[PDB]
Design a binder for this molecule. Sequence first.
Ligand SMILES: CC[C@H](C)[C@H](N)C(=O)O
Length: 186
Amino acid sequence: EGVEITFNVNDYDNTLTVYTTRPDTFMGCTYLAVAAGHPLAQKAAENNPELAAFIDECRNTKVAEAEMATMEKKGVDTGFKAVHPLTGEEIPVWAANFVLMEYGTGAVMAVPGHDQRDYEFASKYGLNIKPVILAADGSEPDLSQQALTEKGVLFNSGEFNGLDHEAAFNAIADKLTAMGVGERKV
Ligand SMILES: CC[C@H](C)[C@H](N)C(=O)O
């Protein structure tokens, strides 16, 4: 059980679509990461040589999902900005070597505040780390060294503040659904 979420991207004729099994974290999404072979990625490589080198480097490294906690994560700003449906604010789209096309939509929503891969990528590239889940003792999570991975009560998540994990999941899934931007998957 997960949700597909569809973002609008400024100066781009298509939409961006992500899949996540953690919609409860959605208010902590601070950027999007697309696979180097994603249509958005090449449309931006058109006016970007750095991206052209990266996409080529990537077309070489057949990265394996299972070898990923081992490989050096690498990525490049696509220049495109996506609009967070609930928040309305702008979030960078990056192209990353750890996102593949073969399985999924080829784009992931990232919450560095609460996914370890997301934290490590955002640390390296000075991307924003937003806390949205509270520590088990009900305090603010310590995000100075690593991501808080635990499931828990949302804060700093606007209307979804105070919901435990299973409530958050549904409340955010239902919102994005009713907004015609999200879709549950069995
Ligand atoms: C906290 C988990 C994060 C959001 C991860 N990128 C996912 O969407 O599965």
